[PDB]
DNA sequence: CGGCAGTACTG
DNA sequence: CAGTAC
DNA sequence: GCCG
């Protein structure tokens, strides 16, 4: 639950304004502060109580106080008039802040302008054609149907293939922004040849409607279940070796902020965590950049990753931040 | 002062 | 590479 | 934006 809604509702506006305008680090600080404020027990009442929470500094506490005594945040009144347009433009899949800012500088103000005059990448044209659909979340039951469709298509090639939807779905959420399907095989090797033939099977069946990204082990695209009343949905599919399964599962399950916290912690302990592996004895320079590789640590299960980092295990539902 | 996660596709 | 995305 |  959140007992600081009257504060966070105002902060989210500012954080989004900073995000679409490209000030990503300031936005990150706002996001983190907003999460910290949602994850609390008591409505904040003092500048001193505010600064005590992790993720809240003097500036953010000043803002919270201006909120408690006045009910309003003056800074909301000086957001640039371009921000709603930038948000509109960057909600196109494949367009971000830089593209939105360029479109805005060219004088474009609406999606009709984009459709008729803008130069679009292949991805951005798919994103525009599904603009409304991609802003919607689906019921988890539909995510289940999409996962089962992928699983049944994959297990037709090799019965031994394991398929797991990993994302807000695995974290137990009632709705899902897209479906994240991780595929492996405990053999350790048969996963190698199935990916392209799987995608051919799904697009031959009419399930896949558009491709966004096509790597050797990574796919991002668009699907739609058959029959009436169905929307187009974003679908991400990864195929990983069994030895990397635990770390791929952890990454793909998220949340994103959870992953960043876990990876930041690993960095403090001279380790490095990615979707491939947890590594130890990684040599870095004075800027936190990697100059030497280190060695992979055995992580047969998600619990092993937590254990090697000195943390208590957190269930997927407990990984929202 | 200066990092803020680590990776992968596109063109 | 810069931009964008998971 | 925050924080070491
Ligand atoms: C966006 C993003 C995702 N991820 C990881 C964590 C996510 O659980 C996983 C899938 O990405 P998403 O599908 O974007 O994450 P989600 O499932 O939580 O969002 P939604 O419910 O709206 O569909 O990828 C990152 O590590 N970093 C990122 O920036
Ligand atoms: Ca998802
Ligand atoms: Na604090
Ligand atoms: Na976008």
Author numbering: 250 to 570
From the paper:
Biochemical assays, site-directed mutagenesis, and X-ray structures of mutants of human Polλ incorporating sequence determinants from P. tetraurelia PolX or metazoan Polβ are used to investigate the origin of their fidelity. To further probe this mechanism, we engineered and purified five mutants of human DNA polymerase λ, the closest relative of Ptet-PolX, targeting residues that contribute to the induced-fit mechanism of Polβ or that are suspected to contribute to a similar mechanism of Ptet-PolXs. These constructs also included the following mutations to facilitate crystallization and diffraction: Δ1–241, KGET, and C543A. Because we could not crystallize P. tetraurelia PolX itself with various DNA substrates, we set out to crystallize mutants of human Polλ incorporating sequence determinants from P. tetraurelia PolX or metazoan Polβ: these structures indicate that a Loop3-based fidelity mechanism is incompatible with the fidelity determinants of Polβ, which is based on a large conformational change (open-to-close transition).
The Polλxt-R construct contains the I492R mutation that involves the position equivalent to Polβ’s R258 residue, and the Polλxt-R-SD2β mutant has an additional mutation giving it the SD2 motif of Polβ (NEY). The Polλxt-R mutant exhibited reduced enzymatic activity compared to Polλxt, with a 2-fold lower kobs and a 19-fold decrease in KM, indicating increased affinity for incoming nucleotides but decreased activity.
